[PDB]
Design a protein around this ligand. Structure first.
Ligand code: HEM
Length: 397
């Protein structure tokens, strides 16, 4: 039988370590024979697993549209996902609006603020000898930075996370769509505020932008607010969560990063290749053949980046975290026109989070009396990472 037949990104079998990795490795093995397979989940769709097959699809925008970027579609009411859910020429026009603020140069001005914030966060529990690395640190670092970027209150991470939960999971329609509406209500308030009292944040910038000389509609602005809050907060928190979990038990990886801080940027890349949370969809717009498979219009193809990132044709020793790996052309941040807008930013956030955490708490391990939990979906990673460590001292407060 085939692992593709029941492949489902929201229901990936977990191995004894609590991750979907044993399954990903088995699927990677089958993909060497069958790089694309049909899954009966979600009414029938294609699962693209080979690295070259994903390349092939992602590069063919004529036949594979981003109208199917999320599948099943994320709950955003009547709003489309800004940039992510569009094809050119529309997609390019909107992305040029936010390209500067997201340029490495524009985000790098937050680097030291990130370091300080990460250290202030660690201070909150270093004296306690225990904490859930995901909720205490991984969820907070990107949520607080994203907040500041969008001109939102850094302290309300919990309300933002609830909106994301609704958008990506919450199985009850009414629920998910009603909570997404709460995000919309808040966006509208924020937009009206910035309209009169502009700031230096990204929302203020797009609010004052124009396409074809005309100002953006409130719907377009809510669209930007949404995709940026989701991007900045979801995958980033699940990726950092998975990295803290890995460093909690992998004493070998951990000691090397402490001994060779200079290898951290490279390691972050390798860790992005191994724990990349994302899987993305494409809507088929015309008959197209990729490998042995011919897809039909209206069908959906899911790009299983985690499998391709383990393709022996593209990576030597794919199942090992080789921190000195270079070049590392993983597909965790996409490729082509939809590349992740937040690529440099997640790299800096991880670099900073890892560096300061290991500097502050070099010794720690998973809590033997509390459970870890892995969230599945289009953005997958550890949701809870209870750890313990010797009690330490705050830097401030
Ligand atoms: C671990 C962190 C992250 C991962 C693994 C990730 C992954 C991705 C992937 C796979 C794409 C391309 C989707 C496609 O091919 O259609 C993408 C798109 C996008 N990401 Fe990220 N992302 C992450 C963090 C971020 C951050 C920090 C932001 C917040 C600004 C962000 C903003 C976006 C945007 C706006 C797009 C749409 C790009 C376009 O369609 O042109 N991402 N991301």
């Amino acid at each position: 039988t085939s692992l593709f037949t029941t492949a489902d990104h929201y229901h990936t079998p977990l191995g004894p370590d609590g991750t979907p990795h044993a399954f990903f490795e088995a699927l990677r093995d089958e993909a060497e024979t069958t790089p694309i397979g049909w899954s009966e989940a979600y009414g029938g769709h294609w699962v693209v697993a080979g690295y070259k097959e994903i390349q092939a699809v992602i590069q063919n925008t004529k036949a594979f549209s981003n109208k199917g970027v999320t599948f099943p579609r994320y709950e955003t009411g009547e709003f489309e996902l800004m940039m992510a859910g569009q094809d050119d020429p529309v997609h390019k026009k909107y992305r040029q609006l936010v390209a500067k603020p997201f340029s490495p140069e524009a985000t790098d001005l937050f680097t030291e603020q990130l370091r300080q914030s990460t250290n202030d966060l660690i201070d909150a529990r270093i004296e306690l000898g225990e904490g859930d690395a995901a909720t205490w640190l991984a969820n907070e670092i990107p949520a607080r930075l994203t907040a500041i970027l969008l001109g939102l209150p850094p302290e309300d991470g919990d309300t933002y996370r609830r909106w994301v939960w609704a958008i990506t999971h919450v199985e009850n329609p009414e629920e998910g769509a009603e909570i997404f509406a709460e995000l919309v209500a808040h966006a509208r308030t924020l937009i009206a505020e910035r309209r009169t009292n502009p700031g230096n944040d990204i929302m203020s910038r797009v609010i004052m932008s124009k396409i074809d000389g005309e100002s953006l509609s409130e719907d377009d602005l809510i669209g930007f607010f949404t995709i940026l809050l989701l991007g900045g907060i979801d995958a980033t928190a699940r990726f950092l969560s998975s990295v803290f979990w890995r460093l909690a038990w992998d004493i070998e990886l951990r000691r090397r990063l402490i001994a060779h801080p200079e290898l951290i940027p490279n390691a972050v890349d390798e860790l992005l290749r191994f724990y990349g949370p994302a899987m993305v969809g494409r809507l088929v717009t015309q008959e197209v053949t990729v490998g042995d498979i011919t897809m039909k219009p209206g069908q959906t193809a899911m790009l299983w980046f985690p499998i391709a990132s383990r393709d022996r044709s593209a990576f030597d020793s794919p199942d090992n975290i080789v921190i000195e790996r270079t070049p590392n052309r993983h597909l965790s941040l996409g490729h082509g026109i939809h590349r992740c807008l937040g690529a440099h930013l997640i790299r800096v956030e991880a670099r900073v989070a890892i560096t300061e955490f290991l500097k502050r708490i070099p010794e720690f391990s998973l809590d033997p009396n509390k459970e870890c939990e892995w969230l599945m979906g289009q953005v997958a990673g550890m949701l809870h990472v209870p750890i313990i460590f010797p009690k330490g001292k705050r830097l401030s407060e």
